[PDB]
Assembly symmetry: D3
Homo-oligomer: 259 residues x 6
């Protein structure tokens, strides 16, 4: 069923729960192959009669450190690759928003940028109190164009959304729950157990009621689709600008950027 997504791990759980695991170098960074697979996996899951609920997590004590340096290098260096990556970033968000089956995220450690999209667009997000949530874009040197403009104002309100998206100050899981960015917060060691119970309970519930409830609520995000697409275009116009070269170098060299 999932042969077309070789960078992703697909592990059956109980009662139609599918465990989807992000397992890659650099605390589950999202590189070119994973970026494509994450974009295009959701429609396949929605048509799979043996899956009722997706439970998504990173391998180990990390959800994702964000786009890999290889992903960013490809985007900066090649026009065709940049547009392909853009199409994938667009479709990750829209395919998730258009997925009728529910998604529960189990967020431990870092959850950044391209991986954070999945963590936060999950229907129910379970965050470690000590998770480290960072959108990351403005610190890298590009606009926050990969999901935040479709949802953050309707998660945390505009004042908190602007504070964290503009500054890229780290948000703990506990603080994320406090302001509404995530559904619930528990101790790190209880994140997977808690997310698993929630996923199993949805999987044994009334399926169309559940799916139709989340589909209806998702119209709120769909109404900000054009807003999201504008943000994405502006992010991608940034990848040929000078700031991102410094932002990326600063990341690679473990130092502060000097824009």
């Amino acid at each position: 069923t999932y042969q077309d997504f070789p960078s992703l791990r697909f592990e059956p759980g109980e009662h139609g729960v599918l465990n989807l695991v992000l397992d890659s170098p650099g605390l589950n960074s999202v590189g070119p192959q994973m970026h494509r697979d994450l974009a295009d996996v959701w429609p396949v899951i929605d048509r799979d009669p043996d899956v009722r609920v997706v439970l998504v997590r990173g391998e180990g004590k990390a959800f994702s450190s964000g786009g890999s340096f290889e992903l960013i290098d490809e985007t900066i260096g090649d026009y065709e690759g940049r547009i392909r990556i853009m199409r994938e970033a667009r479709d990750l968000v829209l395919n998730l928003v258009n997925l009728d089956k529910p998604v529960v995220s189990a967020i431990r450690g870092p959850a950044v940028g391209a991986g954070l999209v999945v963590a936060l667009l999950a229907d129910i997000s379970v965050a470690s109190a000590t998770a480290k949530i960072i959108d990351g874009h403005t610190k890298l040197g590009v606009a926050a164009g990969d999901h935040a403009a479709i949802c953050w104002p309707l998660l945390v309100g505009m004042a908190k959304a602007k504070y964290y998206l503009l500054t890229c100050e780290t948000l703990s899981g506990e603080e994320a729950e406090r302001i509404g960015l995530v559904s619930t917060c528990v101790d790190d060691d209880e994140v997977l157990p808690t997310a698993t119970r929630l996923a199993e309970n949805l999987a044994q519930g009334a399926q169309n009621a559940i799916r139709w409830t989340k589909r209806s609520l998702n119209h709120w995000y769909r109404m900000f689709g054009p807003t999201f697409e504008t943000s994405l275009g502006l992010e991608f116009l940034g990848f040929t600008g000078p700031d991102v070269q410094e932002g990326l170098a600063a990341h690679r060299q473990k130092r502060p950027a000097r824009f």
Copy 2:
């Protein structure tokens, strides 16, 4: 003025406050007459020159347990009745959203389903810290189509909205106020006193200023009217499916549903 709404209690307060009380068996369950009366009372109130403010509450330590089993039976069992009940559900929400006079809710004990609609669409909602707020639909086996999709994302943010609407985990009044679902939280024995003070202050205030302020704010909900109507359609298509028959049987038999 209101002999045409026999299931509701109408009690004048001071300064143009109208007390509207839901008083029925099963902790103020909503049967066929009450469901009809709650839909259609609002336009009559808005045209009544002796009413300035509505203060809505249940009798005793309960707002409402929601639709009665017999109301649900009609929704499942009769084509014309189902459409009638759907139109009433539609118009409860839209007549409230289109009401220029302010409504204050005094929420004690359970507030569920069809009765929760009024509690939460009230302009100012006063919740007991120990109220029990439950949308209830997905546990019954139908989509949450009777109000939540017009408002919950804009009350609590999407992550909290999805958590409670999909799982139907009970929300206390205290937690509801923390996440923004209700306006204010006080101890159970202070709910009606607090609500009465707030209602009387509105009734003695500048009427057009108050009404025009809430009307303008209500544009936000009106923009999600189509979203709401889609949710309502999916809920009511659910009354034609197998899950609700199990969910209703389970509620009657005081046992877990086995979907």
Copy 3:
């Protein structure tokens, strides 16, 4: 010479392209006719000024603004041509700020009321003193809350909290404002300006197009409620020639109002 057309405002260069914009007038920085016009019209000039990267806006001393001056309110009520002029200024204060690409950081101490509050809360990052006093006062004065709240409060604090404060006119401390999402962050009064200064300087040293394009994209959410804002403003201004505002004002200028 750049800002000579705005005589009521103080323009003081900070570090790294930060412009300090200071509201300094008698009566805890009350806003008179010149200042109301200058606050409306300054923003496009700032956006085109290549030497400004970030605006840090504050009142002089322990106040952001106490409200509109006697003279401003008197022209609003007493003269048709002047009233429409003031309405245009009120409209464009909100819309020019929502259309501003450069970031604005507000440092809110003491009272924040009227056009000053508009600026304080539409700032991209709002830093509130724990003991700031935030008041939307309109309905208490006898007019609709038409000067900004309808473009933003539901998407800051959710509808239940927005209706509560806008309909009751209860004072919101800076501490409570931060608890409910109205402002970005809260610190002790003596830390407000240092905190706001750090935040402003950090934005000014960051990746400029990334920051500006992020906030621009987020501001589409407020732009979508433009018509709702303009409805609220029209209703406020229809109120200015009604009997209620005479009593609400007469009362303020002289106890409970007797509407």
Copy 4:
């Protein structure tokens, strides 16, 4: 039921068609009672199970010449009256957009201002080739705030809408059909027969299919409700300005207005 609307003539037709006739002095001028009755009749029709379709027309060879001197002068000269009339103007539009039963208009001769609203918001509008369709507002000296901003762009497109609304050039029934403002155009003596056949065919069709089709389509107008309401406020702020006094004078005295 219908006794509460004394200015309106209600005449049953065949198959559940209700004829609603506007019959008053000055080619069916709308006076204060008629303006109120037209606003408030629609919800009563929707609840009457003996009515399936409304066929609305003027008496004789005129739909309506628009507001009577009394109605216009009240709006200029009295605060309370102006607000009442504004409420009615608002609710004529919104109650029609929210009506599930179909309305067919039979438009002969003049259709102006306040009675034009019903003619054009009818689901099916049958225009005499020689009807004279005049929004009229800018020529009276006030904004076109009584319906056109909820619908004209989605009838004729924006360039045609602005042309006729800004200039107030008369639109013939024939030209109205050419550009899409009305559904069909026939000779004057065929208008009532054609409208009657269409109304009777709707009345004999599949009722919920028809009602739900038009309800769904009406969501498009509802999404421009806030745009409509801001137009309405601007119109009503104009009734306090100097131009309308000259506009009313010029209308009554068959001279070109000299603004």
Copy 5:
């Protein structure tokens, strides 16, 4: 394309894919074709050998609409009805979300379920003597399978309501006059014209074309919730009495007697 057995795929020149609806009985859409039409579009969008789709019926018919087999299942079986509904939803949404351009070549009848594809095509080439009929209200269900996402933005609301409510046949010539289709030619020039247009797109600047149509399609996406409301209402109609009579009347080639 092996997964879409009911569709004919004929490669053309320059990356034009001809997609032909070919079934016995004027290309009625049966169960298999209804599923295939829903799900084919995302596969086309990912196929690097296809640049443009030219969609047509076999012979002098685009499609007579849903087959009797298809309507019977929809009426007769809950699980089937929900499946068919999902397909009806996804036909529209997958077409609206397709980046590659679609040219329709419309000859003879274009009805209901096959009319969806004809009119949601980016460029629609209609025979002057095509017969365009939405068909739903005459069958006895709401027009819920596409028209509410687009007709008001094609022909304006007055023409949209006229044809959707009455189901009067619209010729291709009149359809072009009112803006429902892009262009009109004689029957024998339809396929040549459509082919020339498709090849010109296929030889054009690809991303420019795709991004132009994608951007324009945001207008339809904004009415997604309106479309989904219409679809639910249609599907609630399929278990009502009217459709049984409409279907019977079509079989027997007599007028329906609904009321």
Copy 6:
């Protein structure tokens, strides 16, 4: 007043009509100065108390041939220039949509791309029967991002919008009026006389009524602001692609493009 706009001619007409004339080489091509001047002139006009209405036209037998080859070369060749030009393109559309004073366009000869923006976003557009209206972007090799996505669907409906925007087939002024793209069409020799009459009539009319009518109608375009900005970003991502290089070379060498 207008010292800041050197590429534009500003000539007083009668009664507060300002004649704004585009006069430059190559049939009024838009170079870098004129591109910035056209973007930024509108807010200055709105504040100029001596101007009531703008009448915009080209010098001689052309409105504008659109962007000059130097303007397009800078967009392709320089990152900082490209971003500047994008800002100007954005602000031309938004500043025009946000202008309260009415604009009448007198369209003779070609009106293409960047010059076509002003011609079609004018409130009243008067087209020569033999004007040549060409959006032109897809033929150049970039998306139609400079205005069409904010308005064409609401002018001509989606079928006609897609036809002309995807193909870049020329549209005559006569055909443009038939489909609703422009307000009115007269023969070439009558364009300036007709536009002058209309502009003078507006300038002698009820000023606030006129301005508030067009402002309210412009909310329809504002609601598609995000859609417009998306299209603009996609156009500008096009300028670093291979197609536009070929499209520009094709134009220069007066030949067909070979993408």
